[PDB]
Design a protein around this ligand. Structure first.
Ligand SMILES: CN1CCN(c2ccc(C(=O)Nc3n[nH]c4ccc(Cc5cc(F)cc(F)c5)cc34)c(NC3CCOCC3)c2)CC1
Length: 298
């Protein structure tokens, strides 16, 4: 049985909150992908608690088994409002379950794509909504940084929202990349990686800073793919040459500046998450920033 260490503390399968299987009802499928397989569920104490349920295939390898356990351990040890909570697990029944905080808004990438301003709904999103999401994720990233946990895959695809409408809170919802390393390839998130990451292969919280800058571009572009028209190798060469993305359409200069400082070639020239947060908050208070209209997609 493997042990997991976070914030100087060691835990194992024993420390996970096993919820009796009979207390868990699957309500509906939500979807599947690189994150695994997710359902809406209910937990009763006998008003039940609405949750998300990630499942482990019954037909699976033993590394698969150990992956699932590790994912459970990693999430259960995080304690932050901008990281999805783990309600508990159900590993003593088959198929195995991890019970997570339900995020009714789905993944951030799809939300931004779906909620683009249009002639029919020309004010579905405003700059302040984008800045609030950015702040939400920076806050989760600051927690990770101060706890010396390197995420390694900060991207819109790995972020979730509490709800579609006003008052949505964005949260880090996937830790698969971090789980894999705790245990180059075509699946590597190259377009989110700093130049030194392909090179001497050393990751720091400043490598997360780089990725956060790319996330920021994703947010302000309303969900576009980074480096449009470039392949992984092309991006890699472009980025290490000093090349950087243009601002997303209608991006205020102050917001773009946060991106460009996140993409400084030298790691020590890049802001930590406390500085990123300060800059986002300043942007949030500047009327010329927040009064800037997002583009209408025709
Ligand atoms: C109109 N939209 C239709 C889709 N709808 C939703 C709502 C919720 C989810 C979803 O799985 N939510 C999760 N809640 N908690 C999770 C924990 C964990 C996870 C896993 C996870 C984490 C992450 F960071 C990103 C993900 F995509 C999935 C999810 C939840 C959801 N999931 C989809 C995500 C895209 O792939 C298909 C399913 C969709 C939003 C409304």
């Amino acid at each position: 049985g493997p042990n997991y260490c976070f914030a100087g503390k060691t835990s194992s399968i024993s420390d996970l909150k096993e919820v009796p299987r009979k207390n868990i009802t699957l309500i509906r499928g939500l979807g599947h992908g690189a994150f695994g397989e997710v359902y809406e569920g209910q937990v009763s104490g006998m008003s039940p608690l609405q949750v998300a349920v990630k499942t482990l295939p019954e037909v699976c390898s033993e590394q698969d088994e150990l992956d699932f356990l590790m994912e459970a351990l990693i999430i259960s040890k995080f304690n932050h409002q901008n990281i999805v909570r783990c309600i508990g697990v159900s590993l003593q029944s088959l198929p195995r379950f991890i019970l997570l905080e339900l995020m009714a808004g789905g993944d951030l990438k799809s939300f931004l794509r779906e909620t683009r301003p249009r002639p029919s709904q020309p004010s579905s999103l405003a700059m302040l909504d984008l800045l609030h999401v950015a702040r939400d994720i920076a806050c989760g990233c600051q927690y990770l940084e101060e706890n010396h946990f390197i995420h390694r895959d900060i991207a819109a695809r790995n972020c979730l929202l509490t709800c579609p409408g006003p008052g949505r809170v964005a949260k880090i919802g996937d830790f698969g990349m971090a789980r894999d390393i705790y245990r180059g390839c075509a699946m590597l998130p190259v377009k989110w990686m700093p130049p030194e990451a392909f090179m001497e292969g050393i990751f720091t919280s400043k490598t997360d800073t780089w990725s956060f800058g790319v996330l920021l571009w994703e947010i302000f572009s309303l969900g576009y793919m980074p480096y449009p028209s470039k392949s992984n190798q092309e991006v890699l060469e472009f980025v290490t040459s000093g090349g950087r993305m243009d601002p997303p359409k209608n991006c205020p200069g102050p917001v773009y500046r946060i991106m460009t400082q996140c993409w400084q070639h030298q790691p020590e020239d890049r802001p930590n998450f406390a500085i990123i947060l300060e800059r986002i908050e300043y942007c949030t208070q500047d009327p010329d920033v927040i009064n800037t209209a997002l583009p209408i997609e025709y």
